[PDB]
Amino acid sequence: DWGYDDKNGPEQWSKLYPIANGNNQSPVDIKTSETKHDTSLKPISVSYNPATAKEIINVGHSFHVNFEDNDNRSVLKGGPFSDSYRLFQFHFHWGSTNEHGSEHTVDGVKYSAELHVAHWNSAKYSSLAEAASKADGLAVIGVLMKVGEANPKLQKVLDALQAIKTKGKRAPFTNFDPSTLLPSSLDFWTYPGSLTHPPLYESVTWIICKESISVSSEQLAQFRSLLSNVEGDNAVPMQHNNRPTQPLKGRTVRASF
Ligand SMILES: NS(=O)(=O)c1ccc(NC(=O)NCCNCc2ccc(Br)cc2O)cc1
Ligand SMILES: [Zn+2]
Known part of the structure; x- marks a missing residue:
């Protein structure tokens, strides 16, 4: 099984997943002197229905908030x-201390955490499972999280963690529109x-916001106090889960601005 420790972590993923050394790997460092402004990029449009919020799950290396995806109630365009x-x-994603933790970096600068809002191409494919391995299958919005003032928009998420402290636990998580986090x-x-x-999978069109959002040192501590072990075992806090940045291999980062 893969993880983030020294034996199973990012530098070893290539043994079971050779795509780890591929030409379209994420995350990356965005060098702003090398980005290309593209006038053809339209504004990002998100329209999410809070009734699609479903469940929060401790997946061992992280926690996930999942949404009902049977129709187009919640879409990115x-x-x-x-x-x-x-x-x-x-x-x-977060790191061991405040000085790192984001996945993407901008001009070499590491932030404290990063929010990922993930979507799949329902125009072309019938399910996440079909879409996830297609080059045009997934779209993920990344938001860099800068340590500073407590972010009140995270409150529902943080309040839910006490019920999913150990690996495999899950709980209803309803009536929430994650566009409030952007x-x-x-x-x-x-x-x-x-x-x-x-x-x-090299299946993600990444959308990285220029503006960061805030998070406090104590809110990050809540993430790191989640446990990667199952209930009853020795407690193993989820100290970090960010992958190092990967080579661009000739890709172009385009800017909407
Ligand atoms: N950090 S991230 O880049 O935003 C990020 C990372 C991982 C994921 N993973 C995901 O969504 N699904 C798992 C793989 N697809 C399902 C699947 C795989 C194999 C088989 Br067999 C059947 C299946 O249904 C999403 C976003
Ligand atoms: Zn992620």
Whole structure:
């Protein structure tokens, strides 16, 4: 099984998942002197229905908030896309201390955490499982989280963690619109990339917001106090789950601004 420790972590993923050394891997460092402004990029449009929120799950290396994805109640449109993409999940990545924790970096700068809002191409495919391995199958919005003031918009998420403290626990998580977590401006960078952990499919069009959102040192501590072990075993806090940045291999990061 893969993870983030020294024996099963990102530097070893290539043994079971050779795509880890591929040409479209994520995350990346966005060098702003090398980005290309593309006037053809449209604004990002998100329209999410809070009734699609379903469940929060401790998946061992992280926690996931999942959404009902049987129809187009919650969709992402615009940006580089001609297809509509259906929301299915959001989750976070974080690091061992405040000085790192984001997955993407901007001009070498590491942030404290990163929010991922993930969608699948329902115009072309019939399910997440079909879409997840297709080059145009997934769209993920990344938001860099800068340590500073406590972010009240995270409250429902943080309040839910006490009920999913150990691996495999899950609980209803309803009536929540994750567009409330996005920054005020949706100016973005986009590039073709991958899932940031196994199976590492090169199926993701990334949308990285220029504006960060805030998170406090104590809110990050709540993430790190989640446990990767099953109930009854020795407690193993989820200290970190961010992958190092990967080579661009000639890809172009486009800017909407
Ligand atoms: N950090 S991230 O880059 O935003 C990120 C990382 C991982 C994921 N993973 C995901 O969504 N689904 C798992 C793989 N697809 C389902 C699948 C796989 C194999 C078989 Br067999 C059947 C299946 O249904 C999403 C976003
Ligand atoms: Zn992620």
